[PDB]
Amino acid sequence: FNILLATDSYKVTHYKQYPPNTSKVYSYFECREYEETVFYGLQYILNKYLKGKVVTKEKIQEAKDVYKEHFQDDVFNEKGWNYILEKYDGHLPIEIKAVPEGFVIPRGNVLFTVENTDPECYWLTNWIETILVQSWYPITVATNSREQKKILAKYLLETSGNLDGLEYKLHDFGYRGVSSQETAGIGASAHLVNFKGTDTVAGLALIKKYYGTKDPVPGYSVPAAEHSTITAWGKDHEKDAFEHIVTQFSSVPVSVVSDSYDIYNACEKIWGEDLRHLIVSRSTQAPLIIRPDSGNPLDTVLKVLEILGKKFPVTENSKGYKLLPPYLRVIQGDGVDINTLQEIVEGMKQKMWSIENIAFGSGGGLLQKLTRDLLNCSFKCSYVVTNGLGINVFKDPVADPNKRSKKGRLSLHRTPAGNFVTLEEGKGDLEEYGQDLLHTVFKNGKVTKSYSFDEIRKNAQLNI
Amino acid sequence: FNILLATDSYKVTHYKQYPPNTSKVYSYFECREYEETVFYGLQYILNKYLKGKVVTKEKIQEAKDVYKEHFQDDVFNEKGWNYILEKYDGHLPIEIKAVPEGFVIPRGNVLFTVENTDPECYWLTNWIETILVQSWYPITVATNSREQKKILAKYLLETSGNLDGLEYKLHDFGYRGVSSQETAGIGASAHLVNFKGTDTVAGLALIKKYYGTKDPVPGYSVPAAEHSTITAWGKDHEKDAFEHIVTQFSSVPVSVVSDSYDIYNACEKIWGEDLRHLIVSRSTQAPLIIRPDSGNPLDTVLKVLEILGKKFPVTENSKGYKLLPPYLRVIQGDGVDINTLQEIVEGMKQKMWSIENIAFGSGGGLLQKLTRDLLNCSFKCSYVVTNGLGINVFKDPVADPNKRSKKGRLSLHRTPAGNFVTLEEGKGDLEEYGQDLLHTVFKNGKVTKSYSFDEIRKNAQLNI
Ligand SMILES: NC(=O)c1ccc[n+]([C@@H]2O[C@H](COP(=O)(O)O)[C@@H](O)[C@H]2O)c1
Ligand SMILES: NC(=O)c1ccc[n+]([C@@H]2O[C@H](COP(=O)(O)O)[C@@H](O)[C@H]2O)c1
Ligand code: BEF
Ligand code: BEF
Ligand SMILES: [Mg+2]
Ligand SMILES: [Mg+2]
Ligand SMILES: [Mg+2]
Ligand SMILES: [Mg+2]
């Protein structure tokens, strides 16, 4: 990896465009006005890409040669990058201040700020915009995952009276549905801020290396079938497949995809009659988890539950909702996103089925069908010093007040009512709102403040 | 990177679920029934992740330790992975056959197949489903980018009579808007199959390393301002910023973002009056490219063109469409996706403006706002050998015929009319349809057939 080649091309040309005698460029990231966002993922970027000796003679030469062809011209700031190599042993003279990871902050607040610590390196602040702005992704995954946790918590509490099992109710199925291995690890880690169930194994190593947990692993899975392991037996032998699988995994939970040919026949006849003896004998710690995977998600879940309710001994819990026996559960992992998850739990509640009975899997909805524009994430210069004079700067496009940016040096504060406010124009310096909540997390090539994954999870808890 | 940790967790458990006495599992990828897809990106995955010694004693131990905690149980196929290590020096006994990269194939056709070449490794075929299915991403980017190229070609031809400059009409702005550095390189390389202009520098090294071009670089950029380089001058000094910037880049094309405060004022008064003398003196090879970046994209483009056409001499080309002088062009890089791109070129055509006048930048629309479901990309087992007998297998869920998969051994053929057909059930063996278009690209740890990026671009060309 070469940081000289990890920016938007145009930024290679910007050192020639700032006002002469500019000594400081100061910029900030916000999720510009999903009312609150989980701040998560900057620490991964600081450690993997920004800290330590990130400039060498070889990387400068590599970049020089690439840009000469890419621009068909010499624009590359060879001298400026060489200055960093010679003066600072290739450590970036940058200071980044940030809200603690895991913090849940309303939209429109400063989340981190970036500025150069050497006047010669005024151009460096925005060089690294591109790489820092990618923090949008773990923020957005963590935020959207937490929003689904809120929905699940509301309905689980209402239909059952407690939150038991909540952290296992939304399982990450998105490894194949993301755009890369690196994205899989980042997104899966962001989901694990809120939940514990994951099939996206890449998330584990990332958390272990960059954040750390008291537990050996931050997430867990269970054995589960896929269509190849059912259909390989042949269409006439779906029962033999089911029997073999539950018997191989007789003492741990096992998920078995049941819709290869006819989900309703599988539930009613195969599970509900032919193999019923192998289900009712299972432990509470080792249920069969039936997995439909096609059809209208709500309609399918309701009909599956109706079928099972007729074949197995249903109880009524203390809230008056129906509950399958403890050895039998359902997981819906097709077509799941925040919208359909809401539709399913509401439809279940309306038909008097406890949310205890169900869990969800989600792949693309969880890790891929998200963009930087969902929380309007963006990074802008708000302050410059030119000719020794500090100036508060901003953009304010006539036709889109939504793209208006903040002015001057920024700080994040608690209000007297304990909400958040971002103070502009250096007004934090007046101290009418107590101390700035941002902390220096990176300075001159070093990570200066860090959070464990356990701390992040605590910061990210729901109010309930 | 450890390929034992690069699968969906449940696949770790599948070796215990297939029918006993299974010696072969054979699987295929399709973009299940955007009528045609550009096949691109597999060669990256083969080289980066699948080839050579990918199993070691250490990687086996690491996976074993991780999975023991992840599953709270010892389900991991240590023996099976050890067998590959000892027998094949850690090289995967897998054969993959694929349509050539760059090929443009209608939906619902086999694009590649995967099978194990050693009966002991029947479980391996689908172990690597997760990593191979990520090919959805470069396929989908390449395909969506090419569809935008078709729109641009149609309107450019209609309004100008030719396709000159077509390959520079859609510029990749997506580096900050994708989910990771790795995704940035993959996505950017896929866009470069169709176009030559990019700010996502990461795409260049990926192409150079995995594909190769005769040209020094596969993509190019031009100097361009951003809001920090304009706003840093202070609000009252926008004209000074513009002047400094066009003067710094007087002999190459230069893009200058013009909407920091009031795009219409900037066009009519700053460029069109105060600095007009610095614009009309510019070369045809070094135009000013004015960049709006806010507002309704269609309304804004049209109003900018109207303003400019009143301040600069406009000609009428041989097709009857209005053309700005050659030293002046516009780039619209906000809110651009395939739908808004079509709306803008159509709106322009209606107001009699040549598409020669305009180019586009697109970030999230081009590289992030895409999912595996756009082309319905899926990987399924279609054939297995159990007890020495081959059986054709498939899923066919009752409530969604769209998830029905193909049966048996597959092959891809030209039809007598020159179209494509996927033959099922090993019917390609009858040779009634000319030769199979799938070629072995990977076998037993070796990449056996490779394509240059130049060949891919040729394969992916538009008809016209
Ligand atoms: N453990 C599992 O059951 C498991 C794991 C990974 C993916 N999947 C598949 O993921 C699909 C959902 O993916 P999307 O949410 O990306 O559409 C489901 O159809 C499911 O079959 C299932
Ligand atoms: N060379 C350039 O002009 C350039 C490069 C990269 C990103 N951008 C910015 O990208 C934004 C578009 O990004 P999205 O398409 O992801 O929304 C534009 O508003 C533009 O300012 C511009
Ligand atoms: F494994 Be099935 F095709 F979702
Ligand atoms: F650089 Be601008 F804020 F698009
Ligand atoms: Mg599925
Ligand atoms: Mg912009
Ligand atoms: Mg934007
Ligand atoms: Mg699917």
Curated annotation (Swiss-Prot), chains A, B:
Task: Name the principal localization, coarsely classed.
Answer: nucleus
Identify the metabolic or biological route this protein is part of. Cofactor biosynthesis; NAD(+) biosynthesis; nicotinamide D-ribonucleotide from 5-phospho-alpha-D-ribose 1-diphosphate and nicotinamide: step 1/1
Q: What is its EC number?
A: 2.4.2.12
**Which residues are recorded as modified (Phosphoserine)?**
452
Q: What class of enzyme is it?
A: transferase
Annotated residues that bind beta-nicotinamide D-ribonucleotide are located at: 199, 291-293, 333-334, 364, 372
Q: Name one GO cellular component term.
A: cytosol
Q: Where in the cell is the protein located? A: Nucleus; Cytoplasm; Secreted
Q: Does the keyword Transferase apply?
A: yes
Ranges in a coiled coil:
none
Expression (tissue specificity) = Expressed in large amounts in bone marrow, liver tissue, and muscle. Also present in heart, placenta, lung, and kidney tissues.
Question: In what way is its activity controlled?
Answer: Inhibited by FK866. FK866 competes for the same binding site as nicotinamide, but due to its very low dissociation rate, it is essentially an irreversible inhibitor.
Residues that bear Phosphotyrosine: 168
Q: Name the family.
A: Belongs to the NAPRTase family.
Q: How does it assemble?
A: Homodimer.
Protein purpose = Catalyzes the condensation of nicotinamide with 5-phosphoribosyl-1-pyrophosphate to yield nicotinamide mononucleotide, an intermediate in the biosynthesis of NAD. It is the rate limiting component in the mammalian NAD biosynthesis pathway. The secreted form behaves both as a cytokine with immunomodulating properties and an adipokine with anti-diabetic properties, it has no enzymatic activity, partly because of lack of activation by ATP, which has a low level in extracellular space and plasma. Plays a role in the modulation of circadian clock function.
Name of this protein: Nicotinamide phosphoribosyltransferase
Q: Which gene underlies this protein? A: NAMPT
